[PDB]
Every structure is written in structure tokens, then in C-alpha cells.
Symmetry: C3
Subunit: 207 residues, 3 copies
């Protein structure tokens, strides 16, 4: 039948694993249903989002059915200094330095962090500003996601290194055409055997 995506703690007695969406407080963090964060000590998913400021307007977007490993960190665009000259943020200390407060054109802003659906993000991963992660990708533990990740690619390391693609490009096209995460959830439920077990040529044929 399925659990409730509005239930913050969907596992009996487990107070560390949280469905991300219901916990969110912040307008510009948008996470899909059923995506969870396995906490380390019960900290919120947002507590893992860092350098996130309304002034900049950048968003963190996560798809449906994503796995976020404990300690995964999201570094938003507020982290990058001005690099035209000296990087030191003089204006932060005020006392006559407030005058030199930069505008957003002066900063190296990279865009929103956007993570697709069915992404397995390993433990203690760090995601840097502006990176896109395709559907069905696997981020190895301890990875620092420095660049974009193709759908159904396995990556890892610091800086990020491409390892393998989970399936062929032909099977990858078929998974991206089917987009099971976007189907009505009665249909997800009566095909879950096939989604879990990766027999694309069965769902091939139902549609």
C-alpha cells in the first residue's frame, strides 16, 4: 500500500531517519515525496544545508525517492567570496567596512543545486554550488560532487571522478522515458517488483 510521505519519522522506533519534505521550513528548499535523510543524531536535513541565504535566491531541489546518507552536506552559493581582487569579506566586520558590501553581480554564483529522482547519495557526501545530479545516479560515500552527474552514473572521489554507468545507454534511455517516480502511486505500487528488480522489459510491455 505504501507509507505516508507526510510522516516525518516513517520507521517505528527509528528517530534518526526522516522523510525530508514534511520537515522543510524554507521556501527555496524543495524536496520530492518519499526522499529521506538518515540522520546521524537526529539533526534536520536543513541543518545540513549550508551557506543558504534568501538574499541570493538560490534553490536546493531534490527529486522523489532519493536516499541521502548521514552527514551529506549541501554547500549553497553564499559560500563563494568575491575573487576580482582580495577575497577577504571586509564588509562582514562593519566599523566603516560596511560600505564595501558586494552586489550579487560581483559574486561567482553558480545556480541552484538540483538532484533528480531515485538518487542514492552516499554517506558524508558534500555537494557544491550549482551541480546537477541526474536521475538514478549513485554518489559514492565521502564523495565531493564538484561537477554535474549524468543520469544513472556512478561517481565518487574528491574531486569527483566518473566510475561507471549502471546500465547501458539504451537501457538508460528506457528508464528515463518511463519515469516511474512520476506515475500515479497505485501504478508504482503494482509494479514495485519490476522497479526494484530492474526488469525494464516487463514494464516495457505493460505500457
Amino acid at each position: 500500500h505504501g507509507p505516508d510521505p507526510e510522516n516525518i519519522l516513517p520507521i517505528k522506533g527509528n528517530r534518526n531517519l526522516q522523510f525530508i519534505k514534511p520537515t522543510i521550513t524554507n521556501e527555496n528548499i524543495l524536496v520530492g515525496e518519499y526522499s529521506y535523510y538518515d540522520s546521524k543524531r537526529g539533526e534536520s536535513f536543513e541543518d545540513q544545508v549550508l551557506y543558504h541565504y534568501e538574499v541570493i535566491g538560490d534553490k536546493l531541489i531534490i527529486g522523489r525517492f532519493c536516499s541521502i546518507g548521514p552527514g551529506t552536506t549541501f554547500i549553497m552559493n553564499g559560500a563563494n567570496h568575491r575573487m576580482d581582487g582580495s577575497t577577504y569579506p571586509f564588509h562582514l566586520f562593519r566599523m566603516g567596512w560596511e560600505k564595501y558590501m558586494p552586489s550579487l553581480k560581483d559574486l561567482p554564483l553558480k545556480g541552484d543545486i538540483e538532484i533528480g529522482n531515485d538518487v542514492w547519495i552516499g554517506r558524508d557526501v558534500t555537494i557544491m554550488p550549482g551541480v546537477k545530479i541526474g536521475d538514478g545516479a549513485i554518489i559514492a560515500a565521502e564523495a565531493v560532487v564538484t561537477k554535474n552527474v549524468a543520469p544513472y552514473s556512478i561517481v565518487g572521489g574528491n574531486p569527483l571522478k566518473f566510475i561507471r554507468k549502471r546500465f547501458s545507454d539504451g537501457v538508460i534511455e528506457e528508464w528515463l522515458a518511463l519515469q516511474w517516480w512520476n506515475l500515479d502511486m497505485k501504478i508504482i505500487n503494482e509494479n514495485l517488483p519490476f522497479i526494484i528488480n530492474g526488469d525494464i522489459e516487463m514494464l516495457k510491455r505493460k505500457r
Copy 2:
């Protein structure tokens, strides 16, 4: 003689550095005598063993005289998702999804983590499932051990990248035949100067 291997805190006034073996309470974690964990906040060495589940049956093995740096993490085989089709673990959330429960043969299982003797593991090292680390190797701090490490190798980085060998190939097998760590403690105590000073030819001829 030397310290008592069953002494959990062998350094007086030090509540952080622990001998691993006498703190172990799990039957799948075999650690040799004298190997120590220099902990950060006084936490257990077992606390660093993650995703370790009895139903998987995988073991963590560590030899004798190993230096395990603070924050070293062991990610066991229970951490890898099913990759046949969808990585998402539906069954954990039950409410009808418990039926789609995967078996040991459905998960990608890589085997035990086996660490050798006289290994120096750095601080904040993460060891991936199923990796083997030979005797007398050095793991640089912050390393992520994603593959096996040959005996007496210096390695580090993420992914792990080979740096160099500590001695020549010939000298490395003079050490692996000697196996000073497997000798009686009274033989070790009488030859500690050369074990520490590295005089392999002396130990060879002793």
C-alpha cells in the same frame, strides 16, 4: 614484557586511546592484540563500525600491533543498496512495502574487511566494504580505501591512489616471512630494537 593486551586504557591518565580487542563485544569483529584506537571523544571502536549487521554475516578483521587513527570509519557490507533496478529501499518503511524484502544474494556483497598486522591507519580514514589491507601498510590521513592495499604500501587520497612502497620488493618479503608480530612475546621483546629500527637483516639472521 610490555603492556597488558587486555588493558583497555594502557596509557595512564589517557581516557581516549584504547586497546581494541578487550572492548569488542561483537562476535564478527576479530582484532589482534595490541592494536589500538586513538579515539576522539572517548567513544568505542565499535562505534566506528557502521552498517554492520548480523544477517549479512560479514566480519571485520584486524591484525596485531595496528595503529588506528581517530575517526577512522569502517563501512561494512550492509551499506550498499540493491542496484538491479532501483536503489531505493522500499521495505524499510513497511506499510505494505515490507513484502519486497531483498535476500543476501540480491544485494552486492563484497566480503570481509581484513586488515593486516603492524598497519598504521591515518586519522579520519574511511574503509570501504570488502577491501583487504596487507601487513605493514600506511594509510595517509583522510584517505578513503576503495580498493586493496598491498603489504608495506603507502597510500592515500579519495579515491585511494598508490604513493610508493616502503622498502624494496625483496626486503618486503624478508618482512612477510619473518612475521615478527606472530612470534612469542618474549622473542619480540628481545628484538624490539631491530623491529623498531627496521634492521631486517639482523632479524633475518636471528
Copy 3:
């Protein structure tokens, strides 16, 4: 005009960001004025300096106008084990092993950690022994600094990899010949518009 460099918490209401120099109680750690540490939970910058023993005598020097990201750790030379033979530190456990203690001629010491002026160090950076980081460099977050960083270099990764230089070789030498961080503070304030916006030629004019 400007913040007082001897002020520990130079941002009103902010208990995390600290000017480093006025918090320093241990000699062999020399940090310049206005160099700050953005702490995660209000922890002292010193607490990030690990394996720092007076018996070894190495120093951590940091210039002025540096930004130290939260969680950045400095691994001092005391962290390196002896590598002639067994890296196991027998003498630490005492009980008859105390008399097999190394001298500093026996250990792989690598010198002081020296970081220049106007360096931007990312979050969770780990800096290893003996590394020198030039003026104006930028360290990517999560980087393990395994080697020296040229001035006005951008670097990152584990192990460290060179990414690119911030300006042309000629403009870099101009910034190094100007040394704005060492100018009298009244001189700096008059020219901060151009220090901050990268207009090197008018700075040379000034």
C-alpha cells in the same frame, strides 16, 4: 576605522566567527591580525591544531587577512610515526617499552606549516605537516593539502590538485610586490575599494 584585531568576536551577535590571534594561548602558533576562524559550534581555533607538541618544536604560522573555513584542521609533525621499521609506537604503552623511545632525528619531521596573507581556506580543509601556502591562494572546501600551494593559486581535492591561477603571472607578481596586507592600516583603508575590486594598476599608482 575598521574592526579591532584584538577583539575575539568582531561580529555583534555572532559567537562563532572569531579573530584568531587574540584567542592564541600557546607559543609556536603565530597568526596575523584580522585572520579569522568561522567555527561550527564556537570551538577555539587552537582545538583545530592537532598533534602539536612542544618537544618537537614545529610552528603553525598564518598571515594577516586570512579566512579559515569551519572545521579546517592542521596536522602538525607530531602526527608522523617512525618508519625505519614498525610504525607501532611501542614506547607510549610504557611497562618496560618506555626505553625504546625515538629522538626527532628518527622521525619524519617536515617543518612548520606556513600560510601567507590573504588566504581563503575552505570548509573542512585538512592541512598536513610542512606545507607552505602562498599569499592570496584559494583552497577548495574538503581539500587535503598534501603539498605546497603557489601564491594566487586555486587548489582542491584529496590528494591536492592544481586547478588554475587567479591572474596572469605578471599581475600576480604585481600583487606580491605590493603586499597590501603589510601596509599601515590607514593606507589600507584608503585603498580598500581597489584592493577588493582587483584594480591592481591604480594600487601601484597609489
